[PDB]
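Hello again,

I reread your note about wanting to compare the complex against the isolated chains. To keep things tidy I'm splitting this into two emails, and this first one only covers the full assembly. Below are the input lines as submitted, including protein chains and any nucleic acid or small-molecule components. They are followed by the predicted structure of everything together. The single-chain runs will come separately.
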Amino acid sequence: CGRFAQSQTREDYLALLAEDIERDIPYDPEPIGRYNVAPGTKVLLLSERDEHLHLDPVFWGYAPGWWDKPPLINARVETAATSRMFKPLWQHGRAICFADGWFEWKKEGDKKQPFFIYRADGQPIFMAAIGSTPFERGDEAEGFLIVTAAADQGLVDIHDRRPLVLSPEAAREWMRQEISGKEASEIAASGCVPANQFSWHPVSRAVGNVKNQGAELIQPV
DNA sequence: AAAAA
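Full-complex prediction:
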């Protein structure tokens, strides 16, 4: 899940999670309009602080000063709560990245075919994220990562990993500051949306190039 | 201290 789509209005996503009284997010009717969201860009990221939901543009990627590699973009759910690197983000930096769906490339010989993956019921997805707070500082090295899970049932046909997607109710509980890291692991386990709830279809190979941003990139070929 | 083109 190193690319996804985040194209609808803020309200299209937020309406499933919280009413205005729970937000500290200015109203904006403009569609976010991103059909091809890539690592290293800032991405609108949802989190909870001061008992309200906030939406900040956060660097997709995580590379601390002692990190000598390209920034990581994913954290494995099997070990993130335990990892020396990720445990602090699991404790303090939980967030939600909402999206329309995500892209994965199925390797077929030496060729790669992209797929777009989305909820069969038409709802947006709420991907579990962890990252470096305070999110609102706009850091360009220590941002957020998307938590991954082992691909299950049908998704294994495309790729061996998938984003950890939470139900709207679990997404809300995941973001709460007053729940512990062990509570968050319970929420991740019980709130995970199973693979049977997703559909997918091949898309244009044009999505490979981050310059391309058209609505057609999520349409079937 | 780990996991897209």
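For quick reference: The domain at 1-221 of chain A is CATH 3.90.1680.10 (hypothetical protein yedk fold).

B.
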